[PDB]
From Swiss-Prot, chain B:
<comment type="function">
    <text>Self-assembles to form an icosahedral capsid with a T=16 symmetry, about 200 nm in diameter, and consisting of 150 hexons and 12 pentons (total of 162 capsomers). Hexons form the edges and faces of the capsid and are each composed of six MCP molecules. In contrast, one penton is found at each of the 12 vertices. Eleven of the pentons are MCP pentamers, while the last vertex is occupied by the portal complex.</text>
</comment>
<comment type="similarity">
    <text>Belongs to the herpesviridae major capsid protein family.</text>
</comment>
<protein>
    <recommendedName>
        <fullName>Major capsid protein</fullName>
    </recommendedName>
</protein>
<comment type="subunit">
    <text>Homomultimer. Makes the hexons and eleven out of twelve pentons. Interacts with triplex proteins 1/TRX1 and 2/TRX2; adjacent capsomers are linked together in groups of three by triplexes, heterotrimeric complexes composed of one molecule of TRX1 and two molecules of TRX2. Interacts with scaffold protein; this interaction allows efficient MCP transport to the host nucleus. Interacts with capsid vertex component 2/CVC2. Interacts with the small capsomere-interacting protein/SCP.</text>
</comment>
Amino acid sequence: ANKTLFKTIDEYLLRAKDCIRGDTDTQYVCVEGTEQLIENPCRLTQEAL
Amino acid sequence: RVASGAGLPTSRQTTIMVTKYSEKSPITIPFELSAACLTYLRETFEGTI
């Protein structure tokens, strides 16, 4: 993740996201392309709420 | 349907046929007359005032 500001935000938009199954009770990680990715602001600042 | 991008599944053609039906609710109201009423309506006698 250590990178220049414009490059780090540009890559944060593209890849630095995850996905979670919507069909099932517990949180599973989906295989790529099935359903849309999830934006996580905590991933950029690397801090919790 | 909307065309999907590369690396993602494709929406299939689907057609839906459905049927509706009607309701039924007859209504009733009676009215009544007495024998004297019908007798005086149909059959006058002696014609006095």
